[PDB]
Structures are given as C-alpha cells and as structure tokens.
Nucleic acid binder design. Structure first.
Ligand SMILES: [Mg+2]
Ligand SMILES: [Mg+2]
Ligand SMILES: [Mg+2]
Ligand SMILES: [Mg+2]
Ligand SMILES: [Mg+2]
Ligand SMILES: [Zn+2]
Ligand SMILES: [Zn+2]
Lengths: 53, 104, 125, 144, 98, 124, 105
RNA sequence: GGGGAAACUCACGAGCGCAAGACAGAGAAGGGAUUGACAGAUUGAGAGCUCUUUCUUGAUUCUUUGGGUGGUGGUGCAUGGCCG
C-alpha cells in the first residue's frame, strides 16, 4: 500500500523536466523544447542552432 | 507490491511476440503500448535483465530492452504449452538486406 | 464593562442557522475579509470539518473545571470559526504543537497566526 | 489534414529535438560499428532514418537482428508497424575521414591495452592516409 | 565544506511493529449432516456470496471482498454482551500465558 | 499401470491451466471456487492425513454439480503444478504435497481426444 | 479545362536547401504548358533566438551564447490540374524541408 | 550556480508511511509464503500506520547468509565533459 505522488505536481518547478539530463533547475527552456541550459548547449548542433552571434 | 498473474502473463507475451520491450523512467504512469502499471513493468522486466535474458539501453527518457537467445527459452518455459511456436519478430525474417547506396 | 465584536450568540445562530451545512454558512461569509471569503466560496476541505467536531467534544465533556482537552492539528491554514472560540487547540509550527486559548477576537483570522513558526532574534557577540 | 497545426517555430524546434533524440538513441546502442549521423526525411506518411556508418554490416545485425531491434525500438516510442518508420544503413566510403569512427577505433585500442603514443600513431597515420589534410588527437585523463 | 550527517534515535519512539496476517491450521467452514447432505457454518455475503463467507466480528458482518458491513440492532445488544463475554475468556487466557 | 494417459494428460492439463491464471490452488481456494460453481473440474489427494479433508471436499463437489477425480499421493500433485523446492539450475529435492486442485477453465490448446480422457475418470 | 489554383509552401531550417526547391520548382513549372506560376515569394525570415549562460556551474564572469535557428518560408502559386502538380513535385529535395499544398478553384 | 524558494522545488528541521532488499546458497511454504481491509481505538491525516477484531487474497514470496539497485551524500587536489 502506497499513497505518494499525492501532492499536485501540477504547475511550477516540479511539473517540469529536461527531456534529457532530466534536471528541473537549469533554465528548463520552455520555448517548446524542455531542456536545461547545459543540455541544450550540447544538443544545439543536433537540434540545429548555429551561433555566428 | 503484488504483480497480478495475468499481468505477468500478458507482459511476458507482449515481449515474446516482438522480442523487444520499452519503458520510461516514470513510475506513476502506465506503459504506453501495454497500459500496465509501470511499477509492475519495472518489477517484471528487471528480474529478466538481472538473471540475464534481457539487454538494456537508456537514452533521454527511456529504457530499451531487446530479448536474449537464452531468454526465449525462459519465457517459453514460463508461458507453458502455449509458447513453443513463437518466433519473436526480432528473431527470424531476413527478407531483403538493404544497406542503401547514396542517391543517384 | 466589556463586550464582544458582533455578539457571540447571534453567530452561533448565524453559523448553525437553518442550514448549518457547510462549516461556514453564507452568513458568516458577509463577515469575513475578501481573502477568507475567497477560500470558502472557492473550495474548503472536509477534513476541516471533522477537526471542527473534535473541538466540539472538548468544549462540552470538560467540566466547568475549565480544563479543555487540547485538540492537535497541522491545519494551520484554518480560519477560526465562531464555534471554535473557547477551546484550546494545539497547532503545529515546525517543532511541536502549540496550545492556544481561542478568544472571540481571533475569528476570521488564520489559525496559523498564533503558532509562532520561528523564534525571532536575541543578540550578542 | 494532419491532426494539429503547429507554429512552424514550435514544430521546427520539435523537429530538431526529435533528431537529437535519435542521435542519442543510435550512438548509444550502435556503439560497435562506425556510427556517423542521420539523414532523416520525415513525411506524414513515412519517417525515413538513414544511419551512416563505417561498418554498415554491423548495423543490419546478424539474422537482421539490430535492423529490426532499432526499427522496432522506434516503433515503441513513436510506433507505426506500417513499415512507416523504416531504417536504412549507409556505408561511410572513406573510413579514415570520419572522426566519429576513428574515436571508436581509438576507444577500442585503448581498452585493449595498446600504449597511448603507439595507439594514436596508428589512428593518426591511418587518418592522414585516408586523405586527411591534417589530424590531431587529445587524451586528457589519469595517464598512467 | 558542508555540515556532517548522523543518526541519534530516541529511546522513546523506539520502533513499531507491522501486522502479521495469520491462517490457523486449515479451515473447515462446513459441516456434514446426515452424511448425505453438507452444511454451512458462518454467513455468506449476499453480493459475492456464492462461496465467500462473511467475517463475523463481535457484532458486525464483514466481507473480505465487498467490505459490506451488517449488524442487527436487537442482535447487537444480544451479541455485544455475548461477544464481550467470549472476549473475557480470551482476555484472561491471554494474560495467563505471559 | 496407472493409466499413463490419465496421469500424463492430468499433469499436462494441471500445468496447462496453471500457465494461465485460470487455475485454483489451495483448500481455501478450492472450497471457495467449488461453491461459486467456477470449477469445471476438481481433484483430491487421497493420502491426505487431515481430518475431514477429502470428505468435506467430495461433499461439496456433488452438492454443487462438479465432476471429480482423485489421485493417489498428494506429492504427484505438487509436480503437476510446479511446487517443489527447485534450484537455480533445475536440480530439485523434495516437493510440496497439495490436496486441493481446481481448474477454472481448460486452456484452448488441449485436444478433443485428451478432453475425453479426463471425463474418463470423473466421480462423486 | 479544370483549373485548380495550387499553393506550394516550403519551410526550412536552412537557406541552402530551401532555395534549391524554390528555384527548381519554378524552373520546372514554367516549362510545362498547362502552367501558370506566381513568382516564388519569400515570406519574412523568422528567427528563433536562444541566449544561454555558457558555463554549467555559475562561476567565472558572465558568458553568453547567442544561438540562432533561422526558418525561411517560401510560397509559390500554381495554375494547373491535379496531375500537373504531382508532375512538378517529382524532384529530389533535401531532408528537413516541409512542403505543404493547398488546392482551390 | 539561469538562485524570481509560498508548497513542490530541497539538499536543511520536526513527525509520519512506502521498498521499487533484484540475483544467487541454505531454511520456510497450497495442511499457506504474502497483499488488501470494514469497525472502533490511535493519529497531524478515511496513513490498516498502529492495537483489538476476523475475513479476503495466491505464491508476485518470507527467512536468514551473501549481494544489488538508488542516493542534490564525500573527495574538482582521483577524474572526464564543460566553463572562467
Ligand atoms: Mg581538463
Ligand atoms: Mg539564497
Ligand atoms: Mg520535504
Ligand atoms: Mg552505484
Ligand atoms: Mg547521480
Ligand atoms: Zn539537461
Ligand atoms: Zn462481497
């Protein structure tokens, strides 16, 4: 008998994850792609994000 | 946590048919294709990988398992007189080898 | 020669009025601040109702020997109800339970407002 | 009319992320034959993954093991047994020109206890040989 | 460099045990009458009773399955003093072994 | 001989219905099933040294319209199901003696000629 | 003459490839007789910007990575029959190049 | 430290419950291993959590002796990767 995952992980820091690293801290970049900074920076070239600032 | 017998059966089967099983790192949700309590799918799949009939791979949000040769032997032993004429998809056909040569 | 806010009795009849259904009859509603009214008119819990009755038994059974049975709770979010006056409820803060004698004045106010959640600072170095 | 309409922005970002999903998926499992990349042509009809490797032979698998393992594995996350999601393994013509590959070659030699210098030399020579115009190798770590 | 961890348990909170479900030997719920017919002992749940017996509390009828709870009013005072008497036979014999 | 096909087809079926959830294991289990009239077939271990055991059993069987056969030792039952003290290798030693088996349904992979063998030993 | 106005939409992550489809779709449509083409029109280039603090652990000065993904959308209009289009769409267009079509009369 | 903390996050404090202790050796088990649970009594809490109580359930397991999982726990002076 269990009764966890009771508290409403409905909105905010806990209802978010990084598709990859899975963390919740690093700016979970909502712009459509759930990713923290660190992880995104890694995938940038694979997702398709050039630099040339 | 008890794992229903039919749950067990239903599961080992969904595998033996395909020879492949997939699961997410989530514990509350229900396995996609089978609609089973994941916690149950975890309890069930792990005993396999652990003894050695299952191969595991993990990427982003999912765990990937492909059945082992020694595994079909195990499942068929557990499923009974039903599992004998079973050929996990991943195990036989070889229709037309197709390692593509780049565009014309 | 001292009196009380709006008549401790009018309210017992106001709260336990013809329809003493939801702990806070729409009557008491007219009395509370917007924030409180918000909550009740929104979605108040039932647990808050069984806690209610727990004080009830404490207030009567106890002889006039003014020795109330402390009722323990974590429901620091509860807003004192009229009938909740007189009883001593033990409210958790962080470490233990706090016993507070409910006066007429602490109504409409959050039950948490008395269970000190931290010991402010003394000093020296 | 494909289900839901999506911000060409929103849907494109989704596209990229999916591609980067595939990349972790393949590279992590296809850790035997020279893995390289993926030309993915997605149609509301058929998702076509094209894995490029140094040793395509390894991708197809034995009896057709991996080929089916991967094709099925994908079917498990975004399935469509309708042969929709079909995989193809491309041959990487010049082995020595693919770094993704050479690293694996080096990764292999190092775990087989081949000393560092001797190691790197073989890969570097082999790389230049294949037509490289310049090659470099780095190996940070608790070197002996 | 962070504070250390540790573990000092109160002698008071001590520990707490968990339930230990129990079957007593086998369970012969039936009786053989006229050795040609078979008889019933407990009561049978109405809903799911084609083989399930309800648990007879000291005054309430429980069903291991449907949880249906029943008790007769007039039979409550009668069974309450009958069960409490059988509760004393069990209360005295339990204190004797210790 | 103990009609090889009777005992042989028995264990192939006791293990066939056990590989599927539709099988009943236990005294509590069977007595419960027997009543619900959910047992298309019930077995009883004869060498059962428990008071009124086998009795109360055969008792209900008829009282609820159930076909029934008895097998010599309880031990031979343990095997038909799969209840021994096995070993991560296969090497067994000692086995558990049931006394109450009941099939809720016949697995659909059982032959018409084998089904008749079974009804070829039903009783009280 | 069953004329159908066709809308060719092309959206792409990089300009290299989307310009080839555009350039060739017209090159190919002009050359058919049952064809009427509205010049290849270039919608405004949408840019998705993602600015990120480099380093994982927040130490060292402020370093920011300005990442960009450009999306070029080109639109072409056609005067044809239903077979005519499928005749001109017979290219060999690069990956990640979405092509949507709208048919009206 | 994407550090804008109401909870969550969370690591910290008080109190409470779940095991998701697999896999192996040995002992246990259908004449039951074990889950669940009205009802009062306890709780902060309709947490069987706990006690009294007795009925369900089916070997998914108990038990020890090993031995794992998982861990925002420790060493950035053991290290990759990354960044200043
Ligand atoms: Mg370094
Ligand atoms: Mg701070
Ligand atoms: Mg906490
Ligand atoms: Mg570890
Ligand atoms: Mg970790
Ligand atoms: Zn991440
Ligand atoms: Zn019932």
């Amino acid at each position: 008998n269990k009764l966890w995952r009771t508290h409403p992980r409905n909105y905010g820091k806990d209802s978010k994850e990084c598709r990859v690293c899975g963390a919740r801290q690093g700016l979970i970049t909502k712009y459509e792609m759930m990713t923290c900074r660190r992880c995104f920076r890694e995938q940038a070239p694979h997702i398709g994000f050039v630099k040339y600032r | 946590v008890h794992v229903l017998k039919a749950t067990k059966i239903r599961i080992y089967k969904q595998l033996l048919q395909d020879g492949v099983f997939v699961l997410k790192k989530d514990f509350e949700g229900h396995h996609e294709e089978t609609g089973v309590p994941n916690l149950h799918c975890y309890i069930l799949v792990r005993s396999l990988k652990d003894r050695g009939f299952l191969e595991e791979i993990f990427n982003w949000g999912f765990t990937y398992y492909y059945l082992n040769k020694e595994g079909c032997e195990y499942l068929k032993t557990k499923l009974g007189i039903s599992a004998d004429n079973v050929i996990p998809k991943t195990f036989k056909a070889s229709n037309v080898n197709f390692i593509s040569k780049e565009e014309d | 020669f001292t009196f009380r806010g709006k008549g401790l009795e009018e309210l017992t009849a106001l709260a336990s009025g013809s329809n003493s259904e939801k702990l806070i009859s729409d009557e008491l509603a007219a009395l509370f601040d917007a924030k409180t009214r918000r909550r009740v008119k929104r979605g108040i819990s039932e647990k808050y109702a069984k806690f209610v009755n727990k004080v009830r038994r404490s207030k009567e059974k106890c002889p006039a020997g003014e020795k109330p049975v402390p009722v323990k709770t974590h429901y620091r979010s509860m807003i004192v109800i009229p009938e909740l006056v007189g009883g001593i409820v033990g409210v958790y803060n962080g470490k233990e339970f706090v016993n507070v004698e409910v006066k007429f004045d602490m109504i409409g106010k959050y039950l948490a407002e008395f269970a000190m959640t931290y010991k402010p600072t003394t000093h020296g170095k | 009319k494909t289900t839901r309409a999506i911000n060409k922005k929103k849907k494109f970002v989704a596209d990229g992320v999916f591609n980067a999903e595939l990349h972790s998926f393949f590279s992590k499992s296809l850790q035997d034959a020279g893995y390289a990349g993926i030309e993915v042509r997605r149609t509301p009809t058929k998702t076509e993954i094209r894995i490029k490797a140094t040793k395509p032979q390894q991708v197809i698998g034995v009896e057709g093991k991996k080929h089916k393992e991967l094709t099925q594995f994908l079917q498990k996350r975004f399935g469509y047994s309708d042969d929709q999601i079909q995989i193809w393994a491309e041959p990487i013509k010049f082995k020595g020109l693919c770094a993704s590959a050479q690293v694996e070659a080096m990764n292999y030699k190092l775990l087989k206890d081949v000393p560092v210098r001797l190691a790197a030399n073989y890969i570097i020579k082999s790389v230049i040989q294949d037509g490289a115009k310049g090659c470099e190798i780095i190996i940070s770590g608790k070197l002996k | 460099k962070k504070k250390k961890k540790k573990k000092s348990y109160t002698t008071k909170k001590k520990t707490k045990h968990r339930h230990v479900h129990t079957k007593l030997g086998a369970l012969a719920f039936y009786k053989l009458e006229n050795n040609g017919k078979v008889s019933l002992q407990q009561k049978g749940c109405p809903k799911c009773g084609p083989g399930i017996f309800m648990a007879k509390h000291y005054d309430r009828h429980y069903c291991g399955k449907c949880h249906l709870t029943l008790k007769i009013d007039x039979x409550x005072x009668x069974x309450x003093x009958x069960x409490x008497x059988x509760x004393x036979x069990x209360x005295x014999x339990x204190x004797x072994x210790x | 001989d103990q009609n090889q096909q009777l005992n042989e087809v028995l264990a192939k079926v006791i293990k066939s219905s056990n590989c599927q959830d539709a099988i009943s294991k236990g005294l509590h289990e069977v007595l419960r099933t027997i009543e619900a009239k959910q047992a298309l077939f019930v077995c009883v271990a004869e060498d059962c040294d428990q008071g009124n055991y086998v009795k109360l059993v055969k008792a209900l069987c008829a009282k609820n319209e159930i076909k029934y056969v008895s097998v010599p030792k309880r031990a031979s039952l343990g095997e038909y199901l799969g209840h021994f003290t096995a070993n991560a290798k296969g090497e067994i030693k000692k086995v558990k003696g049931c006394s109450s088996l009941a099939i809720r349904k016949y697995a659909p992979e059982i032959t018409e000629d084998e089904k008749k063998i079974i009804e070829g030993a039903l009783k009280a | 003459v069953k004329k159908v106005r066709v809308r060719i939409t092309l959206t792409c992550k990089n300009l290299k490839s989307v310009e080839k489809a555009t350039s060739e779709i017209v090159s190919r449509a002009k050359k058919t007789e049952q064809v009427e083409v509205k010049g290849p029109v270039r919608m405004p280039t949408k840019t998705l910007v993602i600015t990120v603090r480099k380093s994982p652990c927040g130490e060292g000065s402020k370093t920011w990575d300005r990442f960009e993904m450009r999306i070029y959308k080109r639109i072409i209009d056609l005067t044809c029959n239903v077979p005519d289009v499928k005749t001109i769409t017979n290219f060999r267009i690069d990956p990640g190049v979405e092509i949507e079509l709208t048919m009206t009369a």
